[PDB]
C-alpha cells in the first residue's frame, strides 16, 4: 500500500513506454526521496519540453525554432529528401556522418489495424514539395514491415509522374549476420531483391 | 563425483560446441536413463551419419550418394546455381521454400587469416560448371561478412568473361528491424544500396 499521491505517480509513470508496473513503483519511491530542488527540475523539464516544442514548418520534425537546424544549415543540400517514420529516425540517419541531405518524419505509418491512413500523416504535405522546389532525390526510409513497406510503396509509385528520382532503402540481410542464423522471411526477401 | 563411465560421457559430450558442463551432466543422465534400445538408437545414429556422409560430385554438398537429391532432380532449374559457403547454408536456403535452382557449395571462404586461398575452397569447379554447362544465372550467397564478401567478389571477377547474369543476395535491414537499433554499416548500405522503387 501507499498514499494516494504516490499511487497516482505510479499510475502516471506506468503509462510510459518500457516503464512497467514494478519499474514505476521503484521510480516513484526514488523520485519522492529526491532532494526537492531536483524533483523540481525534473518536473520543470517535463513541462518545459512540451510547451517549448515546435513542429518544423518544412520537415515537420521536432525542434525549438520554426524551421529545423538540419533544414536551416547553410552548407546543406535540401534536394536529397528522406521520408522517415519518427523523430529519432532522423537522429539514427544523422548518426551516419555521410549523407548531407534532408528529411520527412510523419509520426505514423499506414496502419488500418491501428487506424491512421494517408491523411493523418504528411503525404500530400510532401506532395506539395517535390513538384515545388525541384528535388533531385526522394528516398523513402520507413521500417521494412507491412506498415513501413506498404506505406512508402503507396508513395513511391506517385513519384513516377513528375521527373523526381524515387528510391527505397534496402530490405535484406544485415551486415555481419549469416544465412545460418537468419529467419526465413528475411531470407525469402533477400533472395527476391537480389540483383547485385 | 561421477562413475568413470559417466564422467567419460560427460567429458566427451562437453567437447561438442555450445554444450556447457552443467548441460553435459544433465544430458549424460537423461541418456543413461533412457530405455536401452533408445540409447542404442542414438549411438548408432551418430556412427552411421558419420560413415554414410559423401559429397555430391556436382555441387559438393554433403549427401550420401554420388548425386544429391536436388541435383539428380530433373525438374529443378539446373541453369541457376546458388553459391553458398557450407552445407547448412543450403538448408537455410531450401527452408525458404521459394527457390527453384541448384547450389554450388564452396566449403569455406577466402580467409587470409586462417590461410585458405581461392583454391582451398571449391571455386574452380564452380567455373568449370559455368564454362561447360549452360548457366543463365549464378547467385552469390556468401555471408555479408568481410571474409564472405571478399569471397563473393573474387568469384564475380572470374565469372565476368562468361555470358552469365551474376547476382548477390541483398544486404540492408532485415524484416522487423527498426532503424533505431540497426547500425551505421548496415544503414550505409540501405542508402548506398538504395534503388528506384
Ligand atoms: Zn526540419
Ligand atoms: Zn549436388
Swiss-Prot record, chain A:
Pfam families cross-referenced by the UniProt entry: RecR_C, RecR_HhH, RecR_ZnF, Toprim_4
SMART domains found in the cross-reference section: HhH1, TOPRIM
Record-level Gene Ontology MF annotations: DNA binding; zinc ion binding
Superkingdom as given in the UniProt entry: Bacteria
PROSITE patterns for the chain: RECR (PS01300), TOPRIM (PS50880)
Ranges for domain Toprim: 79-174
Keyword line: DNA damage, DNA recombination, DNA repair, Metal-binding, Zinc, Zinc-finger
PANTHER family, per database record: RECOMBINATION PROTEIN RECR
Name of this protein: Recombination protein RecR
Native species: Caldanaerobacter subterraneus subsp. tengcongensis (strain DSM 15242 / JCM 11007 / NBRC 100824 / MB4) (Thermoanaerobacter tengcongensis)
Lineage: Bacteria, Bacillati, Bacillota, Clostridia, Thermoanaerobacterales
Gene: recR
